[PDB]
Amino acid sequence: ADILPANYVVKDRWKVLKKIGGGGFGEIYEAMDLLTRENVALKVESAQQPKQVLKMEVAVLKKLQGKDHVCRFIGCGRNEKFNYVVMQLQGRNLADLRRSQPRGTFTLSTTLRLGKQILESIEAIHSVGFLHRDIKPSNFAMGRLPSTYRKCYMLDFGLARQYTNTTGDVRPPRNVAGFRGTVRYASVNAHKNREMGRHDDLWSLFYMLVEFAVGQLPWRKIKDKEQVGMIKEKYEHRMLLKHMPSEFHLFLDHIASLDYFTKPDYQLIMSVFENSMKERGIAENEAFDWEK
Ligand SMILES: Clc1ccccc1Oc1ccc(Nc2ncnc3[nH]ccc23)cc1
Numbered sequence: 211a212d213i214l215p216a217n218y219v220v221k222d223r224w225k226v227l228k229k230i231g232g233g234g235f236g237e238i239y240e241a242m243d244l245l246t247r248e249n250v251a252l253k254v255e256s257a258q259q260p261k262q263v264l265k266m267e268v269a270v271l272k273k274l275q276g277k278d279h280v281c282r283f284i285g286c287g288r289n290e291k292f293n294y295v296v297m298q299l300q301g302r303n304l305a306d307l308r309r310s311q312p313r314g315t316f317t318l319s320t321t322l323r324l325g326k327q328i329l330e331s332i333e334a335i336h337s338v339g340f341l342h343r344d345i346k347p348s349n350f351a352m353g354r355l356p357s358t359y360r361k362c363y364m365l366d367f368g369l370a371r372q373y374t375n376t377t378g379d380v381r382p383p384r385n386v387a388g389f390r391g392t393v394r395y396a397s398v399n400a401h402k403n404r405e406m407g408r409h410d411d412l413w414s415l416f417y418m419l420v421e422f423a424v425g426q427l428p429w430r431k432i433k434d435k436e437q438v439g440m441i442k443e444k445y446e447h448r449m450l451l452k453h454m455p456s457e458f459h460l461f462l463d464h465i466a467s468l469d470y471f472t473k474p475d476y477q478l479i480m481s482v483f484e485n486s487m488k489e490r491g492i493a494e495n496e497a498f499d500w501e502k
Pocket residue numbers: 230231232238251281297298299300301303305306348349351365366
């Protein structure tokens with residue numbers, strides 16, 4: 211049922227090695243680039259699939275070129291069977307790296323330094339007028355080159371939505387927007403089926419970094435969206451910070467105060483991480499947990 215068979219060759223250049231990712235919206239392959247001789251990420255969707263996402267992904271991926279923490283754009287194309295985008299292949303996914311950890315926790319050193327990079331990548335996609343709307347560990351991966359193995363990359367834009375018009379004015383929010391992202395890391399605004407803003411990506415970051423440093427969220431073994439929403443709406447979020455650096459109270463207080471229209475203070479949140487590291491002699495050149 212795969213769109214492309216193993217060893218299938220696209221535009222006489224990208225040879226399919228294997229499927230690496232799947233789901234109702236399209237498929238990701240590792241391919242060999244027959245020109246440059248490196249392996250690449252090949253994303254395909256059926257030409258027939260009623261919901262066409264790749265055109266979104268390509269537009270966002272092209273707007274972000276020159277920014278760090280984004281895959282290099284290699285190619286894109288349509289035809290009778292599928293559309294495709296070719297981009298730089300990245301390495302180990304943050305979801306897998308967390309799961310590999312003895313306690314399913316990262317050190318604070320790993321956590322805070324991943325935080326800085328993911329926050330940069332969130333500021334980046336916001337700066338070109340898009341929300342990610344599915345910030346979660348599996349949407350980030352570390353590099354697979356001598357030049358990138360300590361760099362964290364935002365992988366996918368399949369759920370992104372433009373929050374601006376042409377001028378950089380914020381779009382009117384719909385009265386209701388059905389939340390489409392991952393239950394675990396969704397803001398209370400997303401659970402309430404409200405138009406997501408930039409703050410909702412920063413909510414997802416907050417929940418992700420707590421899960422990194424502590425190893426679980428309180429609503430961990432709940433897959434029912436509405437249940438998870440009711441737990442979050444009531445949960446005393448300061449509790450989440452019991453075993454986090456105190457500077458995170460600034461992060462929490464800031465994002466709790468934002469609405470759909472308001473531009474977040476990204477430097478406030480960047481400062482939380484840097485001040486947290488500094489208090490604790492955490493250097494930028496420290497091994498990540500999965501090294502040694
Ligand atoms: Cl779906 C999943 C769940 C949990 C852990 C790993 C997973 O597998 C993938 C597989 C591929 C990707 N994406 C990518 N990977 C590697 N290089 C890439 N360049 C651009 C995208 C891309 C993401 C998760």
